[PDB]
Ligand binder design. Structure first.
Ligand SMILES: C[As](C)(=O)[O-]
Ligand SMILES: [Zn+2]
Length: 313
């Protein structure tokens, strides 16, 4: 319950109280729930929405695009990762990541908007940044040596399920780009990532998470402890058992995802992905109505506490 490095209770309740469920849902999630396949108008509109939202935060994040053109099974397609670094001068950062593209389906199909995959992850990152904006701003003004970075990756999904190189367009490109850019102390932007936490497949009822990387299990245990704590504090909804989400062991592994290009370059990863996947995965039923709002807000609360403890907010 109260572990070393945990927020005092009154600090925890104020952090959770800064979250706004209506804002998460309407301001951050709803605008994303459009078809947003790489290169589409909808994808570009979501990119600009992310950029503008992030630039509006009073903490004054450094927000930049990583745009590029890559070969795909459909020919050349443009991709653009959105990279938000709160304090670009800090030595290192906690990096939270997700993908903002939606998987392309055949024409004539019921449109796929990927509510869990990964509109909810994207919206959670925006809500965290906003809810903690005053605290993040003060940490930056105090020149904290560990800042926060948010990555909204493009092109995670295969365009045509056309083999292993038809995937991870944005993350492959960004990891290579970061390895080419000096950082202090660095020596490159890859080494600035103290921990890479990838959110994926979130918002369905009854998710289960396992630790996929022994290297980062301490952070998995922290998330579990936060779940338990929030449960006992009467701060979770529709959560009848003390531990439901963060499970022990590893009955299902990690799957290929946007962490891989980072992992292969030595970055420590925590893969916050439901396994088994949502029932709706990769079907057009992955929509807003099939989300479970209490679970979305429960995850948001867990993550807010994690972020405040990790960064000393
Ligand atoms: C973002 As995925 C787990 O559907 O490849
Ligand atoms: Zn997917």
């Amino acid at each position: 319950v109260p572990l070393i490095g945990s927020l005092p209770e009154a600090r925890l309740r104020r952090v959770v109280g800064q979250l706004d469920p209506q804002r998460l849902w309407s301001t951050y999630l709803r605008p994303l729930l459009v078809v947003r396949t790489p290169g589409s108008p909808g994808n570009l509109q979501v990119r600009k929405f992310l950029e503008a939202t992030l630039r509006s935060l009073t903490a004054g994040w450094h927000v930049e695009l990583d745009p590029f053109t890559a070969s795909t099974p459909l020919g050349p397609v443009d991709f653009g990762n959105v990279v938000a670094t709160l304090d670009p001068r800090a030595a290192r950062h906690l990096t939270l990541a997700c993908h903002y593209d939606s998987k392309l389906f055949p024409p004539g199909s019921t449109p796929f908007v990927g509510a869990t995959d990964s509109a909810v992850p994207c919206a959670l990152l925006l809500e965290l940044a906003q809810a903690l904006d005053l605290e993040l701003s003060r940490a930056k003004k105090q020149a904290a040596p560990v800042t926060l970075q948010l990555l909204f990756l493009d092109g995670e999904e295969a365009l045509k399920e056309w083999g292993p190189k038809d995937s991870l367009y944005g993350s492959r490109h960004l990891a290579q780009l970061m390895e080419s850019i000096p950082h202090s102390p660095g020596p490159t932007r890859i080494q600035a990532i103290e921990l890479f936490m990838l959110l994926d497949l979130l918002g369905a009822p009854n998710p289960t998470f396992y630790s996929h990387f022994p290297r980062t299990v301490r952070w998995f245990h922290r998330l579990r402890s936060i779940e338990k704590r929030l449960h006992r504090l009467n701060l979770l909804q529709s959560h009848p058992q003390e531990v439901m989400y963060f499970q022990p062991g590893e009955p299902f592994g990690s799957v290929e995802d946007d962490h891989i290009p980072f992992l292969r370059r030595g970055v420590p990863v925590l893969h916050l992905i439901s396994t088994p996947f949502p029932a709706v995965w990769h079907t057009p039923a992955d929509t807003e109505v099939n989300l479970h709002p209490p679970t979305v807000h429960n995850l948001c609360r867990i993550l807010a506490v994690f972020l405040a403890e990790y960064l000393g907010l």
